Amino acid sequence: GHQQLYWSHPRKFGQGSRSCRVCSNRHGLIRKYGLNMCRQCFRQYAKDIGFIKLD
């Protein structure tokens, strides 16, 4: 509060814009192919996403 200065700093581009879609953390974020997961959450969910360690 109030309305015209609460969230007024622009969260366009940059690390304050983007966050993990699982844990809402902002660091180590993989945004390739529109994953938008942090690297730890990606390692957790990569097998049932469809990514396999193959070589």
Partner RNA sequence: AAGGGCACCACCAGGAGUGGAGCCUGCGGCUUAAUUUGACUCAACACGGGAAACCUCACCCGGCCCGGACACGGACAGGAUUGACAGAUUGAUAGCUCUUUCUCGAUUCCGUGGGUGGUGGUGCAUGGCCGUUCUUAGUUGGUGGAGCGAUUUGUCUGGUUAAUU
Helix (H) / strand (E) element for 29: namely strand 29-30
Is 17 a residue that touches another protein (CB under 8 A)?
no
Token match 């942090």: residue?
38
Residues 15-54 that bind RNA (CB under 7 A): 15-17, 25-30, 39, 42-43
**Measured from the CB of residue 50, what is the shortest distance to another protein in angstroms?**
4
Is 55 a residue that touches another protein (CB under 8 A)?
no
Distance between terminal CA atoms of the chain?
53
Is 28 a residue that touches another protein (CB under 8 A)?
no
Extract the tokens encoding 40. 């730890």
